[PDB]
Amino acid sequence: GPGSEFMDEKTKKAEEMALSLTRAVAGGDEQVAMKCAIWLAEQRVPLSVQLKPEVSP
Amino acid sequence: MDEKTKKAEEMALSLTRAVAGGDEQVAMKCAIWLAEQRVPLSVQLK
């Protein structure tokens, strides 16, 4: 049911993939960015993608 | 707001909707454009 170990495993994996997408995009790694986006879309993750804010001092 | 930033914002929104809707080809197309432009992104699960 809700709050399962499996759901936490899959959420952890989806968060990893979102971080991998962010890094790949930032570094211009087009092949990895596409594979990360494919994976996220296959899983229909409720993802929010925004432009990173300028936060420097 | 330059034309490249406008497109980046469009691609981020399109990627968001594509992932939620399971649209793999659109997700691919948005991600490769963002990556080529090296757009700094903030990505998080809702």
Side-chain angles (χ1 to χ4, degrees):
Chain A
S4 62
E5 186 183 345
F6 190 61
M7 182 174 258
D8 286 342
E9 291 173 358
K10 299 299 103 175
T11 300
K12 169 61 185 137
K13 176 64 179 173
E15 293 190 336
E16 295 171 2
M17 294 295 302
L19 183 75
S20 296
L21 173 65
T22 302
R23 175 176 175 85
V25 169
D29 197 328
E30 303 181 358
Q31 288 301 307
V32 173
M34 280 191 295
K35 309 181 146 53
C36 285
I38 292 170
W39 188 96
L40 290 159
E42 292 175 332
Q43 299 297 320
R44 287 158 179 259
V45 172
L47 198 72
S48 174
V49 179
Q50 299 186 352
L51 265 56
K52 191 179 190 166
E54 179 69 55
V55 306
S56 62
Chain B
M1 181 96 144
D2 58 272
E3 292 300 315
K4 187 116 286 180
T5 300
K6 273 152 57 166
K7 188 157 178 190
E9 296 275 13
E10 288 158 15
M11 293 288 102
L13 283 167
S14 292
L15 182 54
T16 298
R17 299 312 301 173
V19 166
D23 193 334
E24 285 167 43
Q25 203 282 327
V26 172
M28 273 167 51
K29 182 170 200 173
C30 291
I32 199 182
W33 191 98
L34 292 165
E36 196 256 311
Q37 295 297 309
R38 312 205 185 181
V39 184
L41 297 176
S42 167
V43 183
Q44 68 180 232
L45 313 191
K46 300 179 196 297

